[PDB]
Every structure is written in structure tokens, then in C-alpha cells.
A paper describes a structure:
Our description of the SV2B structure is therefore based on the cryo-EM reconstruction of the SV2B-HCA1 complex, which features a very well resolved density for the complete TM region of SV2B. The conserved cysteine in the LD region, C526, forms a disulfide bridge with C141 in the luminal loop 1 (LL1). In contrast, the experimentally determined cryo-EM structure is closed, with the entrance to the putative solute translocation pathway sealed by LL1. Superimposition of the SV2B-HCA1 and gSV2C-LD-HCA1 structures revealed similar protein-carbohydrate interactions. Both structures share a complex-type N-glycan that is linked to Asn-516 with two N-acetylglucosamines (NAG), two mannoses (BMA) and a fucose (FUC). The most prominent feature of the direct interaction of the glycan at N516 and HCA1 is a π-CH stacking interaction between F953 and the sugar ring of the first NAG. Among these, the most prominent is a network of salt bridges and hydrogen bonds involving E521 of SV2B and Y1122, K1137, and R1156 of BoNT/A1.
Botulinum neurotoxin A1 (BoNT/A1) belongs to the most potent toxins and is used as a major therapeutic agent. BoNTs and BoNT-like proteins share a common domain organization and are produced as precursors that are cleaved into a 50 kDa light chain (LC) and a 100 kDa heavy chain (HC) that with the exception of BoNT/Wo remain connected by a disulfide bond. The LC is a zinc metalloprotease that specifically cleaves soluble N-ethylmaleimide-sensitive-factor attachment receptor (SNARE) proteins. While the physiological functions of SV2 proteins remains to be determined, their best-established role is to act as receptors for several BoNTs (BoNT/A, /D, /E, and /F).
Numbering used by the authors:
A (entry chain B): 875 to 1165, 1169 to 1210, 1217 to 1296
B (entry chain A): 92 to 329, 370 to 678
Write the structure that this text describes.
Amino acid sequence: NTSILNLRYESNHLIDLSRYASKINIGSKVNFDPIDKNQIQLFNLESSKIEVILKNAIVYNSMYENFSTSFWIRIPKYFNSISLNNEYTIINCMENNSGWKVSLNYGEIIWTLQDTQEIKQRVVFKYSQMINISDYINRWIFVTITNNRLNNSKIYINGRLIDQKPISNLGNIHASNNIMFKLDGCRDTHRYIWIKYFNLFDKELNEKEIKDLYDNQSNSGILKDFWGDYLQYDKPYYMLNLYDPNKYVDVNNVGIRGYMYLKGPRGSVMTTNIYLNSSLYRGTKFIIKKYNKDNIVRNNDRVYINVVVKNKEYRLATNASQAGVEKILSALELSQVVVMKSKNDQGITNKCKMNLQDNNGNDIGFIGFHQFNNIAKLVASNWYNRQIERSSRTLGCSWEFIPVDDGWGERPL
Amino acid sequence: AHQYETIMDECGHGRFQWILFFVLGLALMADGVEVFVVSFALPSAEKDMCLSSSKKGMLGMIVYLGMMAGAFILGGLADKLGRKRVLSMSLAVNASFASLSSFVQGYGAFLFCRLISGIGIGGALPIVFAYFSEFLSREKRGEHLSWLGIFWMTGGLYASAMAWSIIPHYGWGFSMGTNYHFHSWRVFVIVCALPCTVSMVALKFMPESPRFLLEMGKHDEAWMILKQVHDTNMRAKGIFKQVWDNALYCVMGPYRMNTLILAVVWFAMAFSYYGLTVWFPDMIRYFQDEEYKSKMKVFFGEHVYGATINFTMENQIHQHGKLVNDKFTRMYFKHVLFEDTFFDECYFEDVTSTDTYFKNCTIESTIFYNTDLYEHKFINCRFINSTFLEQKEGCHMDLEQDNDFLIYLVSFLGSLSVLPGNIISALLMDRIGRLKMIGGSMLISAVCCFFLFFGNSESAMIGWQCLFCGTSIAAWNALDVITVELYPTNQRATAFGILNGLCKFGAILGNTIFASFVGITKVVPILLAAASLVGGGLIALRLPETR
Ligand SMILES: *[C@@H]1O[C@H](CO[C@@H]2O[C@@H](C)[C@@H](O)[C@@H](O)[C@@H]2O)[C@@H](O[C@@H]2O[C@H](CO)[C@@H](O[C@@H]3O[C@H](CO[C@H]4O[C@H](CO)[C@@H](O)[C@H](O)[C@@H]4O)[C@@H](O)[C@H](O)[C@@H]3O)[C@H](O)[C@H]2NC(C)=O)[C@H](O)[C@H]1NC(C)=O
Ligand SMILES: *[C@@H]1O[C@H](CO[C@H]2O[C@@H](C)[C@@H](O)[C@@H](O)[C@@H]2O)[C@@H](O[C@@H]2O[C@H](CO)[C@@H](O)[C@H](O)[C@H]2NC(C)=O)[C@H](O)[C@H]1NC(C)=O
Ligand SMILES: *[C@@H]1O[C@H](CO)[C@@H](O)[C@H](O)[C@H]1NC(C)=O
């Protein structure tokens, strides 16, 4: 890592882990996530702000020194039309109209540089809110930005190059001595953001270094729900299947002879001239139950799965005596133990997956869907357990857990 | 001609002429069912399946134009080639292409098949009348021919009576995305080709025309058929250049004034009759629509709080409504309009809508689950935080309330009303004559038409339709007799064919003009029809006498 700015939260203290130990000032309206204190929530208030006083030797005042920044950010969906064409600073390091800022806009993240001669440059990243399933709306994204003072300035999203623009004409740049994590000029009153793992480096970032940082900060050892937070026990999660995002889970004839299938389409949630997405809060809710005293589910964990039907909890289970490799899944008031898989053989990861096992430890297989007759019934196949050998889209056990959240807008029925 | 007339007189009337009369009334029935299926089936098939306020599609009419060509192509040809062969070919092609039209996917191919079927059948009426005119006794000629006419009318009746039983659901034409079911139109098209099929079965036994055969030559064959007819009656009682010059010989020659007067009369009758016969059901539908539209409920400034709706509300408009925390579950929307209404967290479940339309509405925090309120039903509407769950697919309307059963029943009654009015013309045309009947019937129908302005009601409209149709059938019968009796046997088929083509042309004109002037005025089409009838019934006197 060996960063120059290493803002991290240790022992109810937000401090810079770097050797310089810059000063940190926290406002009174700065919320912190209880389950993970590194995730910081910022509101559109006067006191919802964080300030970093930098050392004199680390104040950027030069015309050739490359530098880079990196952070995880989560942006709740934009709702009302006032947010359009309204660009609000979220990270400010300008003094005398010289420095650098990170700002946002309707479906836009913008990195802006300005010199002492008022030459202004922007590198932007855009995502659409009119999409079936978005990988950037209300979900954690890893934004890193590198600046080489000779050729270009580039912005990468999730460890992948997204944009670059020239700054060669830029002159001397004198950034401010203070970093101001706050929303400025945000006309919408209720706008808030989530930010975590802000790191700064005094050198440009190569692609390999960025990918290493992404792998390190991803925290693959702990499973994640759809939004990218930490997966939790005893919490109702809706189901999503990545291979077919237009179809949701349902149960029929609760009991040993019953079966769960998938029916589509999911539906739609629409606000005219603002957004149009596929409805997520559909299907029978799943709950993960223990078999660590905390309610965070990590990798290589054996659990039970409960389906919530008519506010009654059934256990997920199956019999391995049925014909074929498929063991059509069922809900009961047997083979039920489910191992949670997040990391593959050595380093690969194919999202959160479930591996049904028997009572004696034999691997029944990964949980996916099969077209057994004209109804796509849930199965625990060992074909999926062998397909992952190519590290491709398994198109099976790739399931996403969707909890309820205020950053999405849709309300459950 | 004297010896042939004498031997035909000695042959008399018996079993054979009756059997032939039946096997020809079959073809006249086919003509009637063709007129019905073109004027009240196709026009009520292009109506939009998903609207209770759809207007008839006047696109099928082109088949009428095809009939025109048939009436000149298969009508004039027979006088140069033969009467049994031409009728056989015409009805055979009609039946075959109707059966082909039955097994057709798509509206365009079906309409083309109907057009060629009309081509085939439009040349049937002149051939059947010319055929039967060369077989019956000279003295007892007006009666039997007149009787044949009733079969024509019966055709429409039958074609109507079965139609409402099989396809009382409009929109079956402009819909090919449906399953292989809903094929009631397929079986209807199959069964409407029954009279022509039975006629094709029957015509193998009937012989050719004796007078025409004698005209061409081979007088021994004519003697053979005359002997066969006489024996049957005793046992019971105990080249297109030539055809075009032939057609010109029917108009711009010795037959000049008579053909002009006959064409004028045929056009006038086929204008007024084929206009009114379609005007009356349209007028009755407009009367019902007006009675509906009178009871329209206007709603202004509503505040509906926490209400669960379970019943059906129909024929309403809402303006500036504020529907807050409502719930529409398992209900029917019928002809109800929303304007400037502000919804709030309302819930729509299993709601089925027909002709409803949202306008300028602010719809907020709602759920549309299991509904057919598609996007096209929303006009300039702003959604807020809303959603659209799984929606039903299919055109769902209360078919029991919105169907074509007061358009087929009315046609049935209209065609039925002529049966008492035809017999009083059958056993009368040998007493009053052949020119006083047509003029008198035309003028009396005109007088009845001038009384229609007085009437405005369902019972009144159906009564006036029945009266007019009852007094406008003797005119048709006398017209058929006077147009088959004038020309010789070497020009009869051609002239009858051109007159039938002009009749179909007048049918097009009337069924367009009268059916278009609905809801704009009433005295204009009625005055026009009365003028046409009066002109025809004043000109028809200036005709040569035939008695
Ligand atoms: C469209 O929908 C968005 C968001 O979607 C909503 O999501 C949840 C919150 C439900 O309200 C659903 O019905 C909606 O679909 C709306 O934006 C939200 O508006 C609300 C109302 O102003 C905002 O709520 C704020 O919450 C603040 C914090 O509340 C604190 O206290 C409560 C207990 O009272 C506690 O539960 C909470 O955890 C906090 O501790 C509160 O101080 C403030 O006054 C306000 O009530 C919410 O923040 C908005 N979200 C966003 C992302 O902006 C839209 O209003 C709605 N309409 C339109 C036109 O967009
Ligand atoms: C569509 O309606 C808007 C607003 O009308 C709202 O009025 C509420 C009382 C309620 O009925 C709600 O359902 C409805 O939508 C019209 O805009 C308004 O227009 C007037 C006249 O110009 C202005 O004075 C208002 O400020 C303005 N308000 C808003 C919110 O825009 C709009 O004109 C109308 N459109 C049409 C063409 O019908
Ligand atoms: C009207 O609502 C009541 C209350 O739920 C219900 O019992 C009744 O069935 C509804 N009417 C109809 C016709 O379903």
C-alpha cells in the first residue's frame, strides 16, 4: 500500500494510517455504518462534512509530479428532476480556483483539475439510469484516478480503464491545504453518498497496481449482497439470477412434493424523464440461518436457507434419491446443509453461490435452475460444480442477494 | 322460334323444371350469401378488436369491384360459349377459392381470395336467370322466374341466421397473432360455401340449354333434350373480339334506348336498396350509441380516500380528481376517462379496461400488477416512484356486451320482411303486367322512404326497414323478368351481365355514401334515396311492353 494519505477507521477513531498522520475533523452529522465502520455516509447538511488538514510537505504545488487517488463510492439513485444539470462537489481541494475536485452529476462522476492560469480539465464517467440492471446505481464502485503531468489524466472504474484526457497544456497547480469531504452546491436536499477507503499516492498507478488494489480492497473473504455491502445472517434477502435477470423465484405447493420455479418478467419501476429499471423486490424472500458470534457470513460457512412464504418460514432441502443428476429443490416445514461459496479454487470468484451437501458431507451440488419440463425448477446440480473449472460465467449458481434499501426507491408490495 | 315455342308449350310444367329450379335457386342463394358476407361480414371484421367504439372498416368493398368484372367476363362470355359450362366453371372457381380462403393465414391473402371468389360468383346471377328463362313455358314465365328471386333473398337470411351463431365477435379479420383457436371465422367461411357446393354436385345431372344448343347447331341434341324433358313431364303427370362486339351490339345498335333505360333503372334500384340495407343497422347502432352517450357522468374535484373498489364503473369522466390510497381489484373499466387526476399509492389488481384512457395524470407510488393497462392507454402522464409488474397479454373485453348481434339480427329481419312481399308479386305479374309493377313498387317504396324522417326509435327504425324491404322486392322481380324477356337468346346473357355489373357498381356507391353519412345528418341520405327511387320509377314507364 504505502500510501501518502491512508484515511481509515480504527478503534472508534478516523485517522490517517500513513507516517505523516494528517489531522482529521469529523462533523456532528457524519453517520457511520455500525456493521462496518469504514463505510462513511455523508448528507447534504452544513455539519455533514469531513475535513483533512494535510502536512505542509504533502501540499501539492508543482507542474510535473504525478499523483493518484482511489476510493469506493456508492451513489443512491437520482429521483427528482432538479438533480439534472446540477453538478455538486463531493471532494474539494481547490484554493484560489486552483487544485482538484471530484464532483458528481446525474449519471456522471467527474474529476476536475484547474491550474493557477484558470485552464480547466475534466475526465468524466457516465452511467445511464435507464437500464434493466445497473452495475453502478446505488452499488459500491471502486473509482481510481491517476494523473501523469506530461501526457494524460485517466479515470478507472472497478479496476478497468474508462476514460482519459490530456492535461499537458496545464500549468503549475497549487492545490489547497485542506481536503473537504462534503456536498457543495447540491440543490436536492436529501442527497447523500457513501464513501470508504480513501487513499492517495504521490505517483501514477499502473494497471497491475490498480488491479492489485481492487483485489485487496474487494474483501473476497466475506460474501456480499447485491449492493456490495456485507452479507448478513437472519436478514430477508430477495433473490436474483444473473443468467436470466428478467425472472424471479417462486414456490408452489409447500411440502415434500412441492417445488420452486422461476417466472418472469420481473416488472418495471419507472419515473418519467428520470429513470426506468427492472423491479428488484420480487420473488420469495430467502433468509440465511446459522448452523463466530457476529451475524456476518464469511466464506466456507455451512448454513441453512429458509424461504419466507406467507410470513411462514420453510427450510430449503432436497432428497438425493431422485432420478438424474438434478435434485429438484423443495421447501419443508434430509439434505439441507448449504455451504456458502464466494472464492473459487485459488483466486477466482463467481459471485455468491450455494453448494448443497448431504448430512454426511457429500456434495449434492451447486444450486441453480434447470428446465425440468416447461417449468424452470430449482436444482442442485453437480454439472455446475464442474463447469466452474473454466472460470467463466457459470450461468447457474450465480445468485445475487437483494435486501431492502432506501437508496433504490422501489417499495415492496 | 315458333316450332320451339310450340314444343316447349306442349312439354308443360312438371318434375324437371322444378328440380332445375331448385338446383338454380342454390346458385341464387350463393349470390345472396356473397352479398351478405361482403356487406356485413368483412366490414365488421376490420373493426379494432380492443375497442367497444370501433368503426366499420370499409376495405373489403373492393371484392364488389371484382364482382363487376365477373358479371362482364363470365356474364357476356356465356352467350358465345354456353350456359351450363360457364355456370359450372364460375361456381366451381367460387367454391374452390372460398375453400382456399378458409385455410389462409393473414388478412391480405384472405382478402385476395375473397376478391377472386367474388370474381367467380359475380357472373352467376345472369347465367342462372338466362338458363332458367330458356326452359319454362312462355305463358307461365313471369310466375316461376319470380319464384326464383325468393331464393336470392333466402340466401341472405340464411347467411345472416348462421353468422350471429358462429361469429358474433368483431375484429376476427385484423388479427393473426392469435392461436389456432378463435377460428370461428374459418368454419364460417367453410360453411358459407355450402350452397355452391351442393349446386356443383347437382349440376352434373341437369342438361344444357335447349334453345341455345339449337342456336349453335346440332339440332339432334336439342331434339334429344326436348324428348327427355317431355318424357320426364309425362311420367310425372302420368373470341373476346366477338364477345366485345356482341356487348356493343347490345348498346350502340338496334338495342339502344331499351338498354339505356334498363341500365338507369338497375343503377337506381341497386343504389337505393344497397344503400338503405346497410344504412339501417348503422343508424340503429348510432341511436344506441347516442342513448349511451347521453348518460355520461362528469366528475369534478373528487377526494377518494382509502376506498377499495370491487364493482364495475362505466361511462364516466374524472377531472382534477385526487385519488389517494385507493385500490382497484378485479374490476372492469368501461368508457371511463381520467384527466388531470393525481393518484397516490393506489393499487391496481386484475383490472380489465376497455376504451379507457388516462390523460395529464400524475401517478405516484402505484402498483400495476396483473393488468392490461398497457402504455398506449396513458397519454402525457407523469409517473412518480411507480412500478409496472407482470401484465396480462390478450385483448380482454366483456364480449357479452360488445358484439355484432344487433347488426346480423337486423339484417335477418330485413331480408325476412320481403317474403310476404314477394308472393304477392309472384302470383300477380301475369295480371298487372311487367311495367306497372316496377314503377308502382318503386314509387311506393319512395313514399315509404319519405316517411322515415318522422321516425326516430329502435322499433320505428326496424319497422321502416321492414316496410321498405317488403315493398322493394316486387320491383327487383319485375326488373329481372323485364331484363330477361327483352333481348333474344343470342344477346341475353351479355346484356344481363352488363346490367348486373352496373347493379354491383350502384351497390358500391350506395353502401359507401349511405354508410358514410351517419351521425352528420338524416334528411340528406333519405332525400337522396327518395330522389333516386322517384327518378327510377318515373323512367321505368318509358319501356317497351312485353306481354
Ligand atoms: C420517491 O422515493 C424516494 C426514496 O424512496 C423512498 O424510500 C423509503 C425511504 C420510503 O419513503 C419509500 O416510500 C420511498 O420509495 C423519496 O426520497 C426520500 O424521501 C424521504 C422523505 O423525505 C426521505 O426521508 C428522510 O429521512 C431522514 C432520516 O430519517 C431518520 O429518522 C427515521 C425515523 O423517522 C429513521 O427511520 C431513519 O433511519 C433516520 O434515522 C429524515 O430526517 C428526513 O426528514 C426525511 O424524512 C429520504 O431520505 C428520501 N430518500 C432519498 C434517496 O432522497 C422521494 O421523496 C420520493 N418521491 C420523489 C418525487 O422522488
Ligand atoms: C397537466 O396538469 C398540470 C398540473 O395539474 C395538476 O393539478 C392538480 C390540482 C391535480 O389535478 C393534478 O392531477 C394535476 O396534474 C398542469 O400544470 C399547471 O398548469 C397551470 C396553468 O398553466 C399552472 O398555473 C400550474 O402551475 C401548473 N402546475 C404544474 C404542476 O405544472 C398542466 O398544464 C397540465 N397539462 C395539460 C396540457 O393539461
Ligand atoms: C365488494 O367488496 C366486498 C368487501 O371486500 C367483497 O366482499 C365483495 O365480494 C365485493 N363485490 C364483488 C362483486 O366482488
